[PDB]
Every structure is written in structure tokens, then in C-alpha cells.
């Protein structure tokens, strides 16, 4: 067997601190989301029926990141969906908005969805998500190629991928930004189903190196399950973060609030469970905690963020791709790393532990 | 102290998507059983007393894999249920099917055996599977000897084994097919209790590299969880693998079904427990959860391994091993691998925390 | 991406035992706290508010440490806390004392806060301790300059830091301690929170490292839970070793011992938990087991270190340090190195789980 | 900081199995305990007060191996328990005899206890058990110098040790064995308690190596849990296992049985307990489960060891270790090697999972 190497993922490494002359308040955190849009925070909901419908999008565009309108509903339900972001108006300083002043939003499709895309562009998408299992696919690279050459201002978003092939055959097909991530979400079971996947610290470091050389960001889609994470992601040289279990608690996500012994929940469920589907499945129907507002969610995670790039010394995200050095750690350091030999009592805002 | 190798198992590694043309509800997954006997899907049902007897073998044979009648039983009783499948009667296109067109089965037998053999040979046999804890020694050796002297057009697979010299040794005395896993079965004690085995991955890495240059093929027996373990153990080069845990719960194996506690099961034992040996056994006596039918079992199964193969862009399982690319992942790793920081509350099919 | 080592903690390595002269009872664990500031035995409590108040820091102080009296109050309330302890009055034969024959007391401060400094100068406090959670910052630095600067006979600890180019800074800057651990802390979240930090036992080493080019001690902060990690920590270099967790369950630590289904705890939390700021927090509000007085936890854990000694044949700290030779270990080594297939009737002193 | 090496123990490492022409049944597992003295079969009880009295020792040399008397006891005491050993009679045709055809017998002594030792001999011990925490220390060199010169022909064990130049250092102080295990026995807290321990596979490997110069047996001594470890640890080089935990649920070990929560227990504790020492403690105090016999729990044991050896094909234990080729694995390796994804309903008599 042929074993190309050792993969490694969030919880194998560490940032090492460096000298900083930068207070985490000081450092900015935009960053591109293709080659010509540009994000006020590098966050994006994941394009999940539990996750983003336009309550969502609305909120992740008003706080400077992006929502993605998931694609398990007919055209009209979803230009319908792109038409009330872009509609809505409220405060909001750091908002991502279009030429026009509006809040950006974007849309996922799948393969072959060409009319699909055509009334999302005429309903004013700023971004369409090209979405697969399998985005190192020919199916995926046509459907690239084909939207590309209708409609060449149109940035586009394709995934989801693993490896630096991967990277450059969409690249060469014309895209505007890879996504990365086979295997390392939350409710996702395609790892243990076909034993297929790379770990994602691994996964975003290779398709980066490969995507630099075309100037494609990449967006690192799942698995985060702390603010530093992010960090690392970032540092390790993604330009944005996709979430989807993070944001799932959420008001603004789809679904009612429920309480079962003495817990408030949400539903979320893969776009490949059995359940989103209505293949042999490759994803999970689950619940997570209730956690309030995208607000004070986003708001916690940023100020993750903020802190890493204060302990690196990085005044903004490009400054923390050069500076940051990763450190390998065991798990008895990651052990170490999480609170140990002390009962919590009062639960932190920025860290649960189930 | 002599440490020839870190080695590894299904869990220390994932494949590597590839570029990929075929979707996959277009893969082919035929392959080899043996130099001579072909299987239409890669699965064989285990030989064991809570596995697989007539009912199971029918239904694997229907679904174009095999299953391999125990030896828990008197020559009699085995040659008996070898004969009902032989017997049996659009609905099931893939059946595996002997020149006749009938079912193929197989049958396990001991070391010394020759009596057994007679009769499953004179039943209809398809294959005799010569089964030891230990497939490496000298009593498993002379019996391949004797049994292709006797019998040279009759297809023999031997085992269990985890070694490439082990591997040499069978594929010199005649064998058509090697089976390997020492240790790695969902209810075997055998490295706990001897200290002695080989993790699968690695065992079958270096036994499918010796016997690839004998022509023969390898099963790979034991360990086998999820679905995705299958692709790695056919992408490391098995040409089929030989599944009991999995099909314990269903309506085919033998035994009843039981209620405890809200749940329903069935029976699952070692061969080498106490209560299949009636002594320093090296099993356990267990339960597993119901699972309903062999087929709904089958189809998720090779569900998973198509999809596999859809990953890897590859066209039938030939191809798969050609283009497979693995990568070793840490303890993190799997653990973002499986369902994390959610709560599932419907379960999947082909997915059981 | 750029990965510069792999970084080890206390449960992944083990001393080896050597060659021994001295029983345990023999050794000497006199040490230094400053290039100036020398300690009877090498523990200091931690500067927080559910620790370090007068009643600690005497008791630390008695018995040849030091106590740190932490920050989160007003200026007048920790000059009080630090002038209860210098006028504390055979019993304590190991009084870490001052010229004066008076208890030593550090104290903490932040950065830019030249104000605190001066009033505890005034105070008589022997120590100042300057604590960020980025000690290897432009404000650190320049604070340290300035008190140097200010009160050049005053001694002063810096920190936290976890690289040698942070231990080098700090050390131009004219600091007489460093203090070393980003993220270990029992109550801390700065590495999930920030994915940042360095595993203890390589952030120590590589710390010593480059301060000991400079005769500047290193204090081991933070990651503590066993004796044998005060031990580990030592013979990697550490001067000294700041325990929080460990007190927080003392008679003598700040506030009310209480009762919750049958076990008795006092409050322990992050000093960047939500509740001791009053926002993204870097530690965690919690709850210890009371452990009763901290003679009889120091008692403990000076044990365990004075056994390590004897088990290393040092028969002071420089000379540990200089035999010390360390084994890593796996997760296999740690689970036969705990207490391991038996069940626990009567729990130890010195031992929980 | 100095790093000599990375130490694995027992569950670190499998064996190899191997071309085999012996059945487990024909197997010899006869082994030298010291230079001068043959056990049957290659188990010793622990030298402790709640598994080696007089009933445990007159088993354990019957099934052909040994018992140590602990030394928690007054010399009168120890000596009394001695001549039980050395007066039993009876079946046990493999059992352990001196010249005179009487049980051998073992005895533990402490640092400079030359009078206990006197009484011993007069007594007619086989070999005296001379144990600290630390084997490495000039009161242990001291106290084998003295015995040695006083009683030349008394067979003499000495430990605790874990490194090479332990070995060397009492080999040439005079012992006929050395015992190896510093910190791997299930009640024990060294390693914890002072940092200072080396896994035991490595432990036992490293002195050997040196023990084998001076044709000095060495004592596998603590951290054994299933009968593949005693395979294990003989295969690595040891002449001998010794045993505590899986001994003291037995009927002939000292202690009551009693029950608990509807299941049936016996004592056991560190010898450096708080109880047991009435220095801080080493070791704690606890219970493990009732077992039925010696002679039941000998034979899991031994048949463990016959099948390891039938696998790897081995005629005796010194072929086996000539033999014997170890694999490394990971922490899935090990998951894979206990049951798995079966729930036990009929627990067997050689494997048990707490
Ligand atoms: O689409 C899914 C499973 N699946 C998912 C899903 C979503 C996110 C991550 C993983 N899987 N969503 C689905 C929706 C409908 C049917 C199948 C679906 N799996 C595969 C597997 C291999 C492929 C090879 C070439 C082309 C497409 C391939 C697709
Ligand atoms: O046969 C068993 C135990 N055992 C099993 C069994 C089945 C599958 C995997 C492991 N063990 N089934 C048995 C049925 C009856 C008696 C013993 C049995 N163990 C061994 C062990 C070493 C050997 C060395 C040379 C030749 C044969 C050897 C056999
Ligand atoms: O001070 C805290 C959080 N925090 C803490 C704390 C204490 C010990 C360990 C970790 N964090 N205590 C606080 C008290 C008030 C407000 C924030 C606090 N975090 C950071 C993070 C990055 C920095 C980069 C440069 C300079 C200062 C930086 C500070
Ligand atoms: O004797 C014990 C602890 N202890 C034990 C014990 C028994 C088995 C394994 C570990 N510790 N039994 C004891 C009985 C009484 C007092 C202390 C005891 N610990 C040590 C530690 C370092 C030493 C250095 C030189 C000489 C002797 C040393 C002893
Ligand atoms: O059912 C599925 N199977 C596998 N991955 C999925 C499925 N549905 C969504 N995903 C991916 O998982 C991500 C969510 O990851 P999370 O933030 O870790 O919960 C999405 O952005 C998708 O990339
Ligand atoms: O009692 C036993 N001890 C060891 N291996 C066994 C025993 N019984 C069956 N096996 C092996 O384990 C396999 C079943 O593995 P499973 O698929 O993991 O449950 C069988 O096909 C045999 O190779
Ligand atoms: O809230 C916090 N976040 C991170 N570190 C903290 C916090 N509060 C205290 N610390 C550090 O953690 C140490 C206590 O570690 P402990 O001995 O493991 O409980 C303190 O001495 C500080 O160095
Ligand atoms: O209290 C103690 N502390 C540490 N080791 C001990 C203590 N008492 C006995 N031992 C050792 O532990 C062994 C028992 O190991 P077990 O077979 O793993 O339970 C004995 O043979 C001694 O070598
Ligand atoms: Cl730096
Ligand atoms: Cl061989
Ligand atoms: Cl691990």
C-alpha cells in the first residue's frame, strides 16, 4: 500500500506564541472570500437546511461574514430566499455589502443546476456555492466551466475538496475559491462510510500551497468546533471559515427551539442524512444546544481570533499566515490544553464541554 | 528486544479522494474468491455457529458473495445444510452460481479432516475452507498437501495467517486462496490472551505483496466495523472479505432473536469460546444488536464501497487497488472522523455509535 | 505550514531512576526564587483570588515558599493583604524570611501600572510579579525597563512566556525571573480559546535554556496536579514551581468551604473567567475538593519531590538537575504508570482520581 | 533536558506468530528462577501481605512456581510461615521441590535485616527476596555483599530495578537474580508520586541485555493484567514473572471475602500504603474480585503462555526467546485486539474487562 504521508488535524497542533506589539482590540480581520469579494470577518454559515435560510444570511452579512442559502428547496423558494437578504434593510458598521449597499449573500447548487443559476444571478446572488460530496469530479469541473463561461463576472465557489490536485484542477477550470474539507464535519459519517477523507488542518495546509499559485483563496468548511480553530485554520493559510454545527443553536438558524430533560435544542442534520435527502447516507440527523443569537456566537469566536493573532504579534490576516509557527502536541498535551482536575460550575460563553 | 515494524489497522487510516469520472451506481465490484472461483460482490459470511448455516449461505450466494457452512457440527449435519443450499431455488440477478447454476457454498474443516472433506467433496462443495487459530504450522501445511493430492481440481483456502512467510509457505503447498487475520475478530481474546497477532491493515498489506506473486488472492477476515473498512482492506489489495459481527443480527444467521432491556438482539460468539468449544479459550460469548434482514445489511455495505470507489474515481476493484493512496491519521483525526459534538437522535443505517 | 517541534508535557515523559547515596529524608530542596531571592523549598502559590490572599501567602512563606497576593483589587486592598503578611508574627524552623527577620510576599501587577508598583514598594513587598497573559509583549517589556528603571533594587518577576526568543527578551530587559506557561493551567481555555501555546515540559525546557545564559531562574507556572510533576519540572530546570489548582482546596485559601451532595470544595476559577473579570474569556469559574490545611498539602508534595531525589541519587536541586535523565513514555506507559485494575477503597493522601 | 529514549510496555507491542511445528500442550515451560534454582512453570506470587502467606506459597510451589512470604510480619512470624511451606505434604507431579523433596519457599527482607535473614536460613528458605523501591542504592549493594559473604551457597534476589546499570551494579554485587519493575504494578503510585518509573517492556529488555553478561536471571515483577503479558514478557528475555493482583482474589490469599454490592471481593494493597506501612505513600488501598482458586487462575495463565508459545513455535521458553519477532501497534491497534462491538453476557474465565 502506498502511504503518502502523516495527517494531522486541529487538536495535533498548537500555535507558538510570538512577540507582539499588537492588542487583540488592534488587529483587523477582513479577508478575501474569492479573488474580487472581500469579507469585514472570515465567517460563513454553512449551506445547510438547519443552518442558513435568509434570517441567518442576514445576520452573518450585518456582522461582515456571509450566509450561503442551502439548496434543498426549488428555484423560486431559494431566488425568493437571495431576494430578502438583498432586500433587507435595519448599527450594523461592519455589514458585508455589495457596490449597491446591500448585504451580500450567496447560494449553493449542485451539478448541472444551470437554471438554477440563472435565476440566481437575475435575483442578485453575489456568490454562488457549486457544492458536491466529490468536487474533485468531472461532473463538478464542467458545471465550473460552464458557469464561467455564461456568466465570467459571476465568482463562484467550489467544493468540496482534499488534496493539491484537487486545488489545481478547479483552479484551471476557473474558479474564484476552493473548499476545502472531505470528512471532518460534525454530522458527517463519509470517513467512516467509504473510508474516504483527509484530516482538515492537513487537507487546507496542501490546498492552500497548490491554490496560492493560481491567487484562489481557500475556505476551510467543517470541523470547527472552537475559536482556535479558526486561528489555526486561518494561520495555516485558509482565508475563510465555513460553519455549520456552531451556528445550528442559533435564533436566526431554521427550526423551532424544544426542550427535552431539562435542555433547550435544535435540530441539525446532515444534506446527506436520510432525512435532508427526503446513495447509502453519509451524514447524521442530530440536535445541539440552544446557544441564543448569531450574535453573541460570532462575537465569542472572534474574540478568539483576535486573541491568537495578539499572541502572535499579526496586526491583520495576511501578517498572521507569515508570523505563525505551529507546534506538534500530544494528547496528554492536549489533555493539558483543555481544563483538567477542576469540576466546572458556571458554564464560560466560549467553551462547552459535553 | 527485535521490533520489526509499526503496524497498523482500518483506523489509523483513510484513502485519498482522487480525480474521479465514475459515479458510484457505475462501478463493477466483482472479484476473486480463489484462482478459480469468482464472486459477483466481495463479501463472505463468516464460519460460525452464530453465523452462518444454510439460511445466511443462500442469501450470500443470492447476492453474488458466499457464505462458509461452520465446523461446530458433526460431518453429517454439515453435509446436510452444504446440500440445502445446493438445492435452493430477476429477483436475485447477481447470484453466484456454480457451472450448473447452482448457489455456491463453502464449507470450513480442521486439521486432519480427510473423513469431512470426503463427504463435502461428495456433497456438492464448492470450497473448503481449512480453517486454525494458527495457518502457519506444520498440521495446516501437510493437510493442503494431502487434500490437493486427493482432490487437485477442488479450490482450497487455507488460514488464518498474518505474515508474508506464512503467506509463502501456503501458496508453495498449493493453496488457491489465503485468508488472513490473527486477532483482529470483534469477538476474539487471542492477542490478549496469547499476546501474538498482527494488526489487519498491515497483516493484509504483507500478505496480499507475498501471494500476489503466486497468483493467489487474499481474504481478508475479521475486524470489519463500518463499510468504509471494507474499501481499505480491498484497497490494500484483499480481493474479498469474510464478515461475522456484522451479520450476526440478522433475521438469516442462526439463533433466535431476544428482548433485554427495550433492545432486541441475537447471539454472537468465537468459535474458540466455551460455549462453542463444548479449556483456555480465546473468544467470547456475546450478543449484538438486531439488524433485520442480510440483504438490507448487504446493501449498505457495498453502499459504502461503491462510494468509496466513486472517491477514488475508480472503475472496478482492480482499479481501485491500482489507484489507492492512503494517508495515516492520528487519534485526533479519527476523532473528527466519526459523528463529533452533535447528538444523534435518528440513527442512520450504516452508521451505529 | 511551518511546525517547528514536537512538544511534550509531564504525562509523556518519566525519570529514570540512577544510582543512589542519599535517602529522601537527606536531600535539600532549598532553591531560587530571583537571582537575589532564595527559597527554603520550591513552591509558590498562584496569584489568584481563589488562592493567593494573606492567610496563603503566610502559610507559604512559613514553611520556606512564597505566597504571590494576586491583583484583582483596588491598589489600598492589596497593599494591606502584603503588609498583613510582612507584620506576621522552632514551629516554622524554615521561614523564607527577609533581612529584617520579617515573612517574604510578592505581589502582582499588570502592565503600565507604575502606580500599584510604587505603593507596594512602599509596602515592603520583596517581589513583583508582572503578569500578562502575552508576556512576550511591547508592554511587558517597556514595564519592565521602567521598574528596573525606577527601583533597581527592586526584584522582579516576569512572565508568561513559552519560547526562548521570549525568555531572551526578558531577559535584556533586566528581569530577575521568568515565569513559563502559556495554556497549561487547570482552570485555563487560552489554548482552545486561541490556539495558542507550548506544551509545559518543552516550554520549561526551552526556557531554561536561554535564561540559564543569563542566570536567570525559571518558575514552572501552571499544569501541576501530582508531586511527581513538581519533581519533572525541577530536573528539567525550573528553579521553582507556581501551583494553583493544588491550594485552592486549603483552610487558608480565600473563600467559604461548602458541601454538595456529600463532598466538600471551595471555588477555584480562571483570573480571565467571566467572573473574576467582572468579554471573551481565557479560564473557567469551578470547584475543588477540600483538602484541608496547605501544611498538609505542601507536606505531600515536598514528599513526593524529596522521594524523586532519593530515586535519582541528587542530594540538592542543582545537583537533580544535573543527574536527571528522562525516558518518554506512551499512552499505554501512563495508563500502567496510574493506579491501574484494582479498585480504590481508601484513597491515598497524595493520590486522587 | 535529556530524552535517552522513547519506552513502550506490554501494550505497546504483539508478538509475531511464526512457523510452527509444536502443539501448545507440547510445549516444556520449565525456567531457571536464579542461577541455581529450577521453577516447573514461571510464576511467582508477589512478596505482599494480602496475596503471600503460607496457604498461597504451598499452591504456587505444588503448580510448580513460587511464593514469596512478605516481611510484614516479625521475624518469629515469617520464619513460622516458612516451615509450613517447607513441612506441607499432600497429584502434583509438576510441584517445586528442594533435594530433600519438600516445597521451595521465598522469603522478602529489607535493607540490612541480617538477622531475619539468619533465622530464614536456619529456617530452611530456598532463596531470600531482598526488595526495596530502590534496587539502584547502596544500602541494597550493602545488604547482597554481606549476605553473599556470609551465606555463599543461599540463592539471593534483589530489585527493584529498571536500567541497565542497575543490573550491572547488583550482578556483580553478587545476586543470583535480579527483580525489574519500578512503578508498573496495578496498586502502585510511584510514577506519580515522584515522576521516576520505566515502562516496563523496556524496563525488562534493558536489563536483561545486561543481566544475560553475567548469566543472572532476571524477574519480570509487576503491571501484568491478562496471560499474553507473561508471554510478552518472557519473550523480551525474563526467566520469570511475578504476580500480586492477579493472585489476591484468590481463596488461598490472605484476607476474608466479602460482598459488595452484589459482588464478591478480596483486599489488596501497596506494600508502601498507608495501611500496609502502619515516607509518604507509594501505593494505595483497594479490592479486586473474587476468582475462585490459585490452581484455576495458574491454569488460564499457563495456557495463555502454551498458546503464545505454540504460535510463535517454541519448544521451551529459551527457543521462544530466540524466536520471538514484536510488532509495534497504536492505540487502534490495541482497541482492535480486546473484544470489540460485542456486548459480553458470558464472561470468560481468562478475560475479563472492568
Ligand atoms: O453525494 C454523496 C453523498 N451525498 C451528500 C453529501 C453531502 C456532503 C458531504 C458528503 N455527502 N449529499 C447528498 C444528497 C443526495 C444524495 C447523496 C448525497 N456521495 C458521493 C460519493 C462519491 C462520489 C463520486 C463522484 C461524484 C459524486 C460522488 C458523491
Ligand atoms: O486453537 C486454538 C483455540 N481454538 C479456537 C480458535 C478459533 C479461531 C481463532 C482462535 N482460536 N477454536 C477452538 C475450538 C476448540 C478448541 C480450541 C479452539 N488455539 C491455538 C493456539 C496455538 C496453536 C499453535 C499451533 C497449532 C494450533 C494452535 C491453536
Ligand atoms: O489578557 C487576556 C485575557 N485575560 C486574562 C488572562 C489571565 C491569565 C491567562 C490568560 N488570560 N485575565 C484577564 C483580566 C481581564 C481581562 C482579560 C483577561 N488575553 C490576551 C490575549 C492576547 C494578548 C496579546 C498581547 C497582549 C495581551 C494579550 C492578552
Ligand atoms: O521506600 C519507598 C516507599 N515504600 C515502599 C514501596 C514499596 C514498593 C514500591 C515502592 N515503594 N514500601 C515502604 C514501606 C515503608 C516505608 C516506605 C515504603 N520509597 C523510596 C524512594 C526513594 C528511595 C531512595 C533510596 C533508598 C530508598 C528509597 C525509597
Ligand atoms: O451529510 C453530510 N455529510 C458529510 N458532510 C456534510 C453533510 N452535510 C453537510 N456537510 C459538511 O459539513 C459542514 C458542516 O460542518 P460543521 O461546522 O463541522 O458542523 C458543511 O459545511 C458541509 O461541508
Ligand atoms: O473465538 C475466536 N477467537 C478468535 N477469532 C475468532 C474466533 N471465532 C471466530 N474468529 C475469527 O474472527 C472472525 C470474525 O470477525 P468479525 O467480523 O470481526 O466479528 C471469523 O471469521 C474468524 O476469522
Ligand atoms: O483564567 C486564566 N486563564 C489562563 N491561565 C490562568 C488563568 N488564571 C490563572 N492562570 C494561570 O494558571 C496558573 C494556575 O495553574 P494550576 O496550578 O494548574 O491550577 C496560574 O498561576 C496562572 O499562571
Ligand atoms: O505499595 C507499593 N508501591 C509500588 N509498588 C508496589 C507496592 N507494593 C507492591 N508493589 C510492587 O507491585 C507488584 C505487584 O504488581 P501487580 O501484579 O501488578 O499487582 C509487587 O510485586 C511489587 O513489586
Ligand atoms: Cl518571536
Ligand atoms: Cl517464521
Ligand atoms: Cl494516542
Known sequence: MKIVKRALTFEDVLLRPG???????????????????????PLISAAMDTVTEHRAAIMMARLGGLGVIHKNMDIASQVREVKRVKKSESEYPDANKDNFGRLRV????????????????????????????????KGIIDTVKAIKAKYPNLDLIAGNI??????????????DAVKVGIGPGSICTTRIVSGVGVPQISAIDECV??????????????????????????????????????????DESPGELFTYQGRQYKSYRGMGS????????????????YVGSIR?????????????????????????????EFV????????????????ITHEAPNYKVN
Do not use: W
Request: with cysteine; hydrophobic share 45%; glycine share 12%.
Open 209 to 250: 500551497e497548490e491554490a496560492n499559485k493560481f491567487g484562489v483563496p481557500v475556505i476551510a468548511d467543517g470541523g470547527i468546533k472552537y475559536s482556535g480553530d479558526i486561528a489555526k485554520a486561518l494561520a495555516v493559510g485558509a482565508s475563510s471559515v465555513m460553519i455549520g454545527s456552531l451556528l445550528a443553536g442559533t
Open 106 to 137: 450567496g447560494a449553493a447548487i449542485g451539478v448541472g443546476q444551470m437554471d438554477r443559476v440563472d435565476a440566481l444571478v437575475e435575483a442578485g446572488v453575489d456568490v454562488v456555492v457549486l457544492d458536491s460530496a466529490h468536487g474533485h469530479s
Open 19 to 41: 512577540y507582539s506589539e499588537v492588542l487583540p482590540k488592534e488587529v483587523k480581520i477582513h479577508t478575501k472570500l474569492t479573488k474580487n469579494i472581500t469579507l469585514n470577518m
Open 328 to 343: 506538534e502536541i500530544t494528547t496528554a498535551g492536549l489533555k493539558e490544553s483543555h481544563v483538567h482536575d477542576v469540576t
Open 274 to 289: 436520510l432525512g435532508a435527502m427526503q446513495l447509502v447516507p453519509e451524514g447524521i440527523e442530530g440536535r445541539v444546544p
Open 296 to 324: 453573541s456566537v460570532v462575537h465569542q469566536l472572534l474574540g478568539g481570533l483576535r486573541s491568537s493573532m495578539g499572541y502572535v504579534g499579526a496586526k491583520d490576516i495576511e501578517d498572521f499566515q507569515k508570523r505563525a
Open 162 to 175: 482534499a488534496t493539491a490536485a484537487a486545488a489545481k484542477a478547479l483552479c484551471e477550470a476557473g474558479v
